[PDB]
Ligand binder design. Sequence first.
Ligand SMILES: [Cl-]
Ligand SMILES: [Cl-]
Ligand SMILES: [Cl-]
Length: 296
Amino acid sequence: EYELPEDPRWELPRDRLVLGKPLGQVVLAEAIGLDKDKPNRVTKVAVKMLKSDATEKDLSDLISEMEMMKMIGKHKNIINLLGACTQDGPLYVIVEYASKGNLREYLQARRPPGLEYSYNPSHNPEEQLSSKDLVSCAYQVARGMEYLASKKCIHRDLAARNVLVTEDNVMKIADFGLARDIHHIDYYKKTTNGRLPVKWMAPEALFDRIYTHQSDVWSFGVLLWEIFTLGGSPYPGVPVEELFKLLKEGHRMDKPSNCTNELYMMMRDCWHAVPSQRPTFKQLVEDLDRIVALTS
Ligand SMILES: [Cl-]
Ligand SMILES: [Cl-]
Ligand SMILES: [Cl-]
């Protein structure tokens, strides 16, 4: 056995957790008595756990994320820590559940049947989003990142795929507390859900692997492009191999078909080549708030 830290304010007895279906390892579950003021209320939650092939370092990473969430604290627009099971078995890290999945697939399923968006790959199409909904969506993500930035949390992989949507359509940033790998992990390597993380990385992160709040702001720019393409894929037809060269030479994605000039300028600002010139999430929140108000 190892020494998993018990933490009385967060510890939950395993019998109070009823395992549902898998999420992604992460699974859906029901928790009885989360608020131990209300011991008779079931809460639907997501449960982070190790894979069957997990290693000591993997265990250490999960604990790191858990402890990190404690220190970062709560915000409306992040996936919050709710509890943990460290005793009688496999480590379970309990977090907030977002029933409507990640933002990218959420947007794609809501594309109009037109053609100035790409095709709607969902067999279960939903109503589409108003112009104010989309800007309000960007606002929420910015607010979450503004909070994280204030807690000196650097995400290193902000993308629509890492933003979750609740039953009440609240945007929540996911996997912000993940640990940085001490080995030179290949970013050209495609992730399990087929995404190429490299396309969201700032130039300085690609070149010297320097990650900062400003590099997170770069990623938010790419995320902004994802939103107003309703889940579009970045740099269409550009080989990853040549992405850095092109960015250095000042290549930037073109304005999405349905996007205001103000919002595209915001993207561009986020994509400034000099990190110090990019806006801050604080500035981004302010500006987006004004824009939300004027979109209606
Ligand atoms: Cl992913
Ligand atoms: Cl992709
Ligand atoms: Cl697309």
